[PDB]
Symmetry: C2
Subunit: 291 residues, 2 copies
């Protein structure tokens, strides 16, 4: 309405301008009072296409904005847009200038088995930017991500017997979660063959006494142990999912280390090979100045 002062945007950039599917771009914006004065309740909005085949999803964050220590408003990044709102303490400040930085995930849902290049638009005030998102055409790995709607946790996956192979042996995983994060035991979700789901302690207990498969975890040490007896492991597929809570919000990367022991039918035993994964942290930042 009359309280949108996005016209005050002086600069709008995205970096990179082109990303792999599931990658992220950093949006940087600057603003001043070149179009009109900023007052309490005014808002400055960065939009991006968030609803179609090629879209952006913001990494959710709320940052307090200060001028020389004084709290004058906030930067709220949601999945659909980023909004700067000025509080009643902005009153009286002259020559107002500001900046924000935040992160958007790009996704390309185009259904071709080929490569596909498409783009989503980012817009603020007088400025537009295009982000191009390119979609590209093992017994065990570990992976992880930060969900756009949950930037204070890392989601981790122990993906076991992914081709439902015959298994000669038991399967053993030994997992050390690296520093700056804490296991949430209640977060455990184990899906077998994409049909059964076991949740939290009760689920871990179900898996155990039903099929002798044992997940044991120590959140103080960050250790998780996985044992699957040969009988239940053979031809079965396991996705062991869990969250860590972020303890160090300024850390750049969260790491999770595992070692695995298993013997696939008609193959040599794997004997404590390392399967590690890093997840990049996300941020938002911003500042106001004036007199």
């Amino acid at each position: 309405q009359a309280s949108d002062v996005s016209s005050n945007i002086s600069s709008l950039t995205v970096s990179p301008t082109q990303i792999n599917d599931g990658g992220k771009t950093t949006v940087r914006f600057e603003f001043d009072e070149h179009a009109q004065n900023i007052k309490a309740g005014d808002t400055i909005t960065v939009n991006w296409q968030n609803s179609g085949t090629v879209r952006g999803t913001g990494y959710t964050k709320t940052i307090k904005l200060e001028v020389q220590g004084k709290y004058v408003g906030d930067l709220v990044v949601t999945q659909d847009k980023a909004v700067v709102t000025f509080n009643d303490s902005i009153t009286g400040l002259q020559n107002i200038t500001g900046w924000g930085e935040f992160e958007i995930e790009g996704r390309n849902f185009t259904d071709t088995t080929t490569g596909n290049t498409g783009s989503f638009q980012v817009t603020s005030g007088g400025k537009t930017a295009e982000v191009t998102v390119v979609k590209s055409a093992v017994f065990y790995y570990k992976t992880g991500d930060m969900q756009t709607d949950d930037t204070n946790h890392v989601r981790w996956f122990l993906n076991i017997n992914n081709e439902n192979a015959y298994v000669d042996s038991d399967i053993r995983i030994e997992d050390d979660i690296q520093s700056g994060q804490t296991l949430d035991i209640d977060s455990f979700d184990i899906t077998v063959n994409g049909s059964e789901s076991y949740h939290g302690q009760e689920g871990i207990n179900q898996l155990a006494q039903r099929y002798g498969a044992t997940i044991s975890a120590d959140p103080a040490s960050g250790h998780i142990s996985v044992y699957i007896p040969q009988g239940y492991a053979s031809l079965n597929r396991f996705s062991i999912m869990y969250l860590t809570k972020v303890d160090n919000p300024d850390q750049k990367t969260f790491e999770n280390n595992s070692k695995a022991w298993y013997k696939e039918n008609g193959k040599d035993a794997v004997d404590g090979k390392e399967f590690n994964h890093s997840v990049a942290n996300v941020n938002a930042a911003g500042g106001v100045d004036g007199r």
Copy 2:
């Protein structure tokens, strides 16, 4: 000689006065200048019987002694005796008073299958004390101790299949070392059936590729994992020994937690039962005053 001023001992106590075999007593002594003045090089010695059937072994420590910050000598506790020695900075100090505290392990090696009560003598200057030491007449447990000659480490033992039973399953141990101490990987010593010894990384590697038994450890997290395949576990006995380095010298107790999974022949599976152990820390302390 002329430089022994143990006659200056004013007080000598042991607490407890009677202990179980392998337990400890706290020796407390006070001294002044009632027999003669204390000068540089003079020594005050607490002796104890250290060589027979019932004996004491001191918990080795060296403490700096200060009067109002000034370093004036040391308390050296060895396995055989405790000695206070005054340095050249004691010169000029008047009305010298002091105290020491340290710990002795009592042992009773008497070869009777019965109970046996015996005693060792502690002596300093004019004072004597007697410590009485009383000797009393599972598939898996964990235990530990502080060696009298190595008070900056805790020695830990994972004692597995202690009666050389038939084993239905693999054996799995998951061990979390508690805070204030760090695993020394090079310290691993695994004895099988009291005949073979495997030392450090090379030994762990021998056990692995020879008999498929895997010890995996993470000193940063304090986690140790033990896997013994059913084939090598059955009728075999394992003592897995390792050291932690003490990181917090004033901590009262060091703890080590384990959980075990195994099925003894003709018994029900044990499924993550806890087998924890605490080791009491040892100390020595002392002070000098004067003007």
